[PDB]
């Protein structure tokens, strides 16, 4: 995954792919 706001947790739109 790629964390799009960079907080150290994958959630929301980050999990999409």
Q: Which residues bind La ion (CB under 5 A)?
A: 3, 5, 7
Q: How far is the CB of 16 from La ion (least distance, A)?
A: 12
Q: What angle do CA 9, 12, 3 make, to 5 degrees?
A: 40
DSSP annotation of 4 reads S
- Closer to La ion by Cβ: residue 7 or 17: 7
Q: How far is the CB of 17 from La ion (least distance, A)?
A: 14
Q: Tokens 């947790």 belong to which residue?
A: 9
């Amino acid at each position: 995954f790629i964390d799009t706001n960079n907080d150290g947790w994958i959630e929301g739109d980050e999990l999409l792919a």
